[PDB]
Amino acid sequence: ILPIRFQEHLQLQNLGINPANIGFSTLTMESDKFICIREKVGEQAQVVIIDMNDPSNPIRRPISADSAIMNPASKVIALKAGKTLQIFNIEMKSKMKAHTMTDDVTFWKWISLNTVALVTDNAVYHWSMEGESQPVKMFDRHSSLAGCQIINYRTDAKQKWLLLTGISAQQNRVVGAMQLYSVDRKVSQPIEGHAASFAQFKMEGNAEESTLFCFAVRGQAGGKLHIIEVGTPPTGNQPFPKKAVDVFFPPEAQNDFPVAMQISEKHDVVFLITKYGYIHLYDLETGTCIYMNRISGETIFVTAPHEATAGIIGVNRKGQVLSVCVEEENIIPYITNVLQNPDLALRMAVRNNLAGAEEL
């Protein structure tokens, strides 16, 4: 029995998607509701939008955009061509917002239902869709990310901790460079890391949720996963004790590294996916590694939270849309009987109201 449920939702090539457009710079998946692909049909650029609730009926539209990102919840698309940004409500056939940057945007992403983050060579901006807001600079980029391909930007729930992630080659490996910025302290911290997420976690004995920062890295010391509280604990809270655990890479995966992370706050579990298709699960509280295995023979380049199961959904270069979530009926006996960790099993059972620890 497996502590996870692993599903294939879609094979994009069955919708006529050219596998040449299945990659990081042409396919976006900002949430589990839509996938968006830029393709050139003949001389014409277009965008194909796949509604994950109705995948046999993709919308195709001509565009002149070098990047397209759908809103996480609504058919509202952000498109850019160089310095020109335009936000369109597709169903209303209207341009909601336009802005012209004074720098190219090398990465952008919806960080919430209504804010787009924009990364230039020099800085990171947030652009709210409310009212007449223009982009606001959040911080300047740290020099440790200079030259990196930017691959992710995330925030905590309150948008007080901001995390920029780049990668580059140093000594013939892929090295991750992160910039963690505190909005309240206005201080950046450079961190070596490949994939990360924030999460809200309420410790036993605390009245308030802690904000945790979880990041995985393959460094010189090998693979490591860290879980720490960021910021000053809310008044009355105990601090969350820092965790650090190994991230295993097998000897035949010598150039693999972590590419994606999502955290289930329903199960307090960390899903970590590596570039070459390995899935790891860790307990958010303790960092204990629950499971590893390989789920994709092709590289995975984009993930989102899989809302329904509180898992992780993603796309590989073949165009499979795959998800992993916790198998709620199996996870506790797995931990008890295969990992032989009754302490963790029992803890997770009562912590997240899962069945199976009636017998340990």
């Binding site: 539209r61 001509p62 565009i63 955009a65 061509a81 335009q86």
Partner: peptide, 7 residues
């Protein structure tokens, strides 16, 4: 000049 057009 819209960068998204009708179908």
């Amino acid at each position: 000049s819209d960068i998204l057009f009708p179908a």
